[PDB]
Subunit: 368 residues, 3 copies
């Protein structure tokens, strides 16, 4: 029983689901273990949709940091006087500020669309709600939460004309994810500003994580990372975003983040993971696809890919965070201590500890 | 039983009250219902005084944002080396940082003073204490907490002498709201820096909501707003203030705030409010003077004025908030959704939906 | 039973102890009383070590602000690619960012090293672990929490080798504080960059409190203070620091902090304290060496030095705090009230109250 490990088979909850897609909502990081109390303002959401589909317009009382894992998406935020569409390619991340009206389009003809978004609620710490303008057989419109009179007066129309057209009390769709026509998706898809190299530092438009050189790259893995220091949208939430690939056989060298609580959601592959906290204590767990693991601050952990692996991470409390590795060449903390202290720290000689710490010639990603 | 509705008749608790006025303190937002757990650090205080009165020198462990609803006050914040007097007119807001000693004078001869302040306690979340320098039949001077021994040394005098002059253990006032002499009102008034139009963006002196033009305004209402973008003192608290007037029979069209939790205080008039949440849920309540009603972020709501109405709204989590109306013409977000999305959203055409939304030729406030 | 008084003989808890020093942790501020709930995030640690000792390398899931009470010291912070050593003298203070590995050496040949540090946990509010890199009879290195397989792969080595050198499953030391060879403390002493006059506004380097002129100084007491305004480290924490010596028989005139919660620890000598909260509630207390007294924000309090006293204060939420005195000539709020409001606020004339306030002709510290 690993309180920091959430098995996707019994730790998500499906909000809506039909033949065109499903939306799933992770449970609450502190109802799992109160050790996770400082994540109580966060939730993980997973969205998947078949090709040629639309998530009907809606808003929620929560900041959204959405990241596109695979597929292509049209993200359209509607304002009161304005509108903004965006063409999302894999790797792209975008913030939906709380209570924006927005719909998602999957224009691809044969590929799905998988989005994980980080959700920070406004009203209730950890708990949020989805407001759907649309009138579906699944959900009532929140327009229906008003009275006949208040609707009549507000639309300057009698109630049948506003019922035959807005609410529909057989005429209305089956779900909050429905199919589209190609003539629609053709018309929709032409005005959507897409991600670029010059967006790595924009307060509006979506940025791509991988579009820059990783920070860690070798023949066994690559470590893409954007931090609050480079991107204003992330400075506002104080979160780093990282996508790292781990080739099968290889592993990520045991390390700890200095001050950041990391939320990693496995995207592809399998992996084992070892975490140490306090007399020491090992937190191992066997992660497959769509699972989630969370690493407390300054908690050293190893990620061991037992198949071809890519995960996404969320770094909570990400300002000025430092990754300290414990083995390998570059960015070792144990190889920076004064020699006479290394003598004193472990039962060994300065030369004898200097022997063991220099052996491993490679840094970050080694082979197993 | 509306969790978001707080009724004056049974939601307030009187901190002090005599013939000359009374300070009432609204119940904690979170004690009412855990739904409001985010406002736990906020309290609403009502202050009311009779003419030619003064509230004796005190300080709280609590930041104040005080809004003079009716009357005219002469607010004097004292510091350890300075003294500041501010002539406040109805509509004036100012901010009393916490631990600032101050007093409050009603100089008028026939009118009452009706102030409401939003309070942000420092020490214990949602709970502060008032600390009166003065020694009155209703409360000791907090200099009495100390021992006689310490008092003699600190002031360099025998205790009989300091107890005759500061504490008075019949020569003392009845309460903390005392009556005034005209000659003294004559003296205390003449130095008061008055709120201006150059002050709308000043870090000290107060600032008048109504001074600039309304954000919205037709023949059925006026919406006055002021935001952290325009005002330093408000950007600090990250709050917007708004005062809005609805004519008898008119209503504020259905709309929602994006991320701002709005504490509205009904100041004059009578309304019916309708809040919607989630399957939808109507939260209707019928409101009268001094009533309080909290609208969570991203919750749609309509204000129906059943008699000429004016309320005050505190906006919590204000920075970059957006008001999205569901009906009318200007700032309707239903009317910004792409046409092909209106086909698929509501049960009916996009010429049928384009027909309905165009009916109401007005915006913001309309007539019932 | 005063909820703001943490007696040293039953409010502390030893983390580790041996012949070479010990490390206690002050109990949770809120556990004691729910009144101290806004201190839920802060902890106090006490560090005392013998001459020519070391604290083996380690880190914590906590920010640290460590203050040097007495002794000299070498503090070494090791990064993934850098190492930095600081020479700490009495009255020096440094921030150790969360999860920064570090060790601490006492280079002096007879003097102890008393250090005290305020801690801000990053994972559990008010709760953090130490992670010791070293292998010792008292603790396991947090490398033991990885499997053999994983350990072997990472280092590139048989387990029989990484155990013989790093872990040791007799050859290992007894505690986390060990004694040192004089040539060893010699070699650790010669790169340490020391605190200066150049370092009171340096984001990296330690700063001396007593390095600048006190804010208050007279033949009975000195008052040193560094504020968020003048230091970059105390501004990201939003905290002030103060050392204040009070000669025996003197005292620190009644006063209160406008918005700072103050944690004070007594460094030497004895004081009586009186604190007033609210009808007025005195909270009196006879403090000795090592006790902690908390003053919530805006509560007036006095410190009464029964023996050549000096103490340390951590100011929580210090940005723009004002100190406000009630006796003595300078910084006297009670002297800044208008005359005619002095008439109304106490039983006594303006001539009468003016007379009694002018009597004490000194400021800040006076002879009792």
């Amino acid at each position: 029983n690993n309180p920091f490990y959430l098995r996707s088979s019994n730790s998500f909850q499906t909000l809506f689901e039909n033949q065109n897609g499903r939306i799933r909502l992770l449970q609450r990081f502190n109802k799992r273990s109160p050790q996770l109390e400082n994540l109580r303002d966060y939730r993980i959401v997973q969205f998947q949709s078949k090709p040629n589909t639309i998530l009907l317009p809606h808003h929620a009382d929560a900041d959204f940091l959405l990241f596109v894992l695979s597929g292509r998406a049209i993200l359209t935020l509607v304002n009161n006087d304005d509108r903004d569409s965006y063409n999302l390619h894999p790797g792209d991340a975008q913030r939906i500020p709380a209570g924006t009206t927005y719909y998602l389009v999957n224009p691809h003809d044969h590929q799905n669309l998988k989005i994980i978004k980080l959700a920070i609620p406004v009203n209730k710490p950890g708990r949020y709600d989805d407001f759907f303008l649309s009138s579906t057989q699944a959900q009532q419109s929140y327009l229906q939460g008003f009275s006949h009179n208040i609707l009549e007066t507000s639309f300057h129309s009698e109630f049948e004309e506003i019922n035959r057209v807005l609410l529909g009390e057989q005429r209305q769709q089956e779900g909050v994810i429905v199919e589209l026509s190609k003539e629609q998706i053709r018309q929709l898809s032409r005005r959507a500003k897409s991600s670029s190299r010059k967006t790595i530092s924009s307060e509006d438009e979506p940025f791509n994580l991988r579009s820059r050189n990783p920070i860690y790259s070798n023949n066994f893995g690559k470590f893409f990372e954007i931090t609050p220091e480079k991107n204003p949208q992330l400075r506002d939430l104080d979160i780093f975003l990282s996508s790292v690939d781990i080739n099968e056989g290889a592993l990520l060298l045991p390390h700890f983040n200095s001050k950041a609580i990391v939320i990693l959601v496995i995207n592809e592959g399998d992996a084992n993971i070892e975490l140490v906290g306090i007399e020491v204590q090992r937190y191992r767990a066997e992660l497959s696809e769509d699972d989630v693991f969370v690493i407390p601050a300054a908690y050293p952990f190893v990620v061991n890919a037992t198949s071809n692996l890519n995960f996404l991470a969320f770094g909570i409390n990400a300002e000025n965070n430092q990754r300290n590795f414990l083995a390998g060449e570059k960015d070792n903390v144990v190889r920076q201590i004064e020699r006479q202290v290394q003598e004193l720290a472990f039962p060994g000689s300065a030369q004898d500890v200097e022997r063991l710490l220099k052996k491993q010639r490679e840094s970050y990603f080694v082979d197993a």
